[model samples]
Target: KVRYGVVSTAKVAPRFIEGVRLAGNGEVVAVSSRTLESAQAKYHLPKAYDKLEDMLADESIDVIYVATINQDHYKVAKAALLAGKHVLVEKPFTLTYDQANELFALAESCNLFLMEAQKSVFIPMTQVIKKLLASGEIGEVISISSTTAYPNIDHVTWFRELELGGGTVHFMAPYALSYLQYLFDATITHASGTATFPKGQSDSQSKLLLQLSNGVLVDIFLTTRLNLPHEMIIYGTEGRLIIPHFWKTTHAKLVRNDTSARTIQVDMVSDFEKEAYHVSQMILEGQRVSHIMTPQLTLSGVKIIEDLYRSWGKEG
Candidate 1:
């Protein structure tokens, strides 16, 4: 097992700690925050650092899990690699593709593992669906429709600022993007969207349309102002795969469109355990890049998001 040091004491840290423990390949031994008290908030951490830099220097921390505000992901990830530790930063890897590119470049140079902590990509349903697609069980996929919503958003300061990387697109699109990257064999050909920004806040809601080179027309709508059932339907020549709460779903439905439909169920560990295990295995195996969370996977999506932001006049 490897020792992990978390760079922030946000709620995600404890959840990730539990996941690492559950995965059995890593242990979160310490945490660092702005204050030692905040760092020590974890229940069983062996050590705590008053400063992020102090934690970065500790020899015991083999990896750093960064859970900072969206704006800080790039800076913290760069520091962790410089400290000679493998790093896993939270979703929406960076606000810009350049930061995303630079982070991966640095990791390869340092010969260390670097992956965005996106659990949905490593989950079991994602695995089964990929196999189904490859097997052609769906028979020449045609189009995709997916939607996500957040009916209530707390008035967190950074969460509403477009420049700080706040938006349903920033917070929600990574999962969908990764899903497309994972479940489909294609790259974006054209993308367009309409968004509603509430005053200075990030887009409170959006409808994004993308056309893929594989002849798939994809539609995604995300909202921070309404409650919509989060679902994705992959339509193919023969049938479709229906995913409800696609991001963290344990079950899905496969419909043949002519005869029958069946529910596909997968076992569940904690949501983040599979992701933790996968990352630890990659590090232990000396793999600089994850086979699943590939470097270009989110980077391609990052490019699309940047273009979308630019089109919306939200680019910084």
Candidate 2:
């Protein structure tokens, strides 16, 4: 079994716990935080650690799932790698490209399996989309457009702190970028974006222009606005594919320009289960890195967002 040591009590952490259980070949045996009791009590986990060093010292843990606060991702993932444990980090793998590169390099040097916990690229719908593209059902993809947003205005302090990795780009674009990277089997070759900030706060809205290495152009709008619907549209020579909601998509609509519109649906146990299962399979197979969530993909994503933040900050 692939034993997981989860590293946070964040809201998204529980889903990963459930996901590992659903993976059939793995279990999250321990969790850590600044304090241990809450993690133990809340997750009903077998072990808990208030100190990260103590957690990393455990010989029984096969890997660590870093679900800590955004800014803590790189630090924890780095420590996890150094401790000789494989690492699965949450989205926005790191605040910048260099940090992401360093972690991946360290993982490579350590011969440990490492990947961002990017579930979108592993989900059934995206996988189906990949097959559909390969089948030439959509013909050549010409252009793509997407919107990433949250539907509620419920404000959290960390959500607005730039120092903590709060921004629309870091908040949601990881899912979109990873989806594109997986589908096109490519990386962004060009990027231009503009953003808005709220009175010395982190970015709240942004729009980006991207060109994948395969020559596909993409337009993305990122925001916290609830009114704008969340979705993706892919324009191809034959037709357009419409995906509703970015992450954990169950189905997507394909409208052939010459034929008709139909939706393609696929299998899903839990949004996180497929990725967790994939992670377990890789570990069992003695792999040290994910072919799916490759290091280059992670670097491209970090570079895009980091550069966009820089451009936006200067102008805003």
Candidate 3:
């Protein structure tokens, strides 16, 4: 069985705990916080560390899961890798492309597995949709559009802090961007976008247009201040596929211009555990990188968002 150690007791940490429980092959052996009491109080784990350094020092921990704040991701993950442990980082792999590249290269040098925890790609329904698209059921994809948002008009907490690596684009775009890459099986050739900073600190809304190598155009929108449905539409020469709540989707619909439509459904389940299992299996197989959440794909996503922030003078 794989033993996992987690850093941080943040809001997203509980979800990770549940995922490990569901995975069955792994258990969260330890959790670290700035204070041991908080870690002990938050999780019923076999061990808790007041300092992350202590957790990394433990020889029993086989893998480290970094679910800390955005800005802390690289630092924590880097330490974990240097400690001779495999790492599974939460989405938005790093705050910048350089950070992601550095981590992947470091993992390679250490002969350890490194993966971004992108749960969407592991969803059964998403796999089915991927296969359907590959089968040409929808023909060649012409245009793709996706939206991910939350009603945060108030601009509260870290969601509005640029220094904390908080912004709609940084927090939400990775999901849409990664999914786009998976669907097209291509790299983004060009990207142009506009952003709105409601608090004059970080983006509250953003829109991006991407051109894929296969001549497919992708339109992506993200916002922290809206109530838009989280959905995606893939328009092809023959038909269109609509995925509602695309990030956690279990159902989709195919509509043909020829007056025919059909519904597709997979098992309704959260993919977090499946993703955890996938990564664990890859590690056991002695794989350095995961095919579903590859380092190249993670780098592409980071590069796009980094460039987007640079275009808005938010990053160098």
Each candidate structure's count of clashing pairs = 0, 0, 0
Clash pairs (backbone) in predicted model 1? none
Against the true structure, candidate 2 reaches a TM-score of: 0.94
- Candidate 1 residues 62-169, lDDT tens each? 899988888899999999999999999888889999999999999989899999888378888888998988888789888899989877766556778887889888
Question: What is the lDDT of every predicted structure here?
Answer: 0.86, 0.85, 0.86
If the candidates were sorted by their lDDT against the true structure, best first, what order would they fall in?
A: 3, 1, 2
Among all windows of 10 consecutive residues in model 1, the one with the lowest summed lDDT is 34-43
Instruction: Return the lDDT, model 1, position 40.
Output: 49
True lDDT of residue 304, candidate 3: 88
TM-score of each: 0.95, 0.94, 0.94
lDDT of 2 by residue, 1-316 (tens): 7999988777767888888889888988888778755755656677888888988999999999898778889989999888999999988899988899999889989999999988388888887888898788889999999987774634556877788888788787888888888897888889998787888677778888899999999999988865787889989999889999857789999999968889888777789988999999999999988898888888888888888887766322
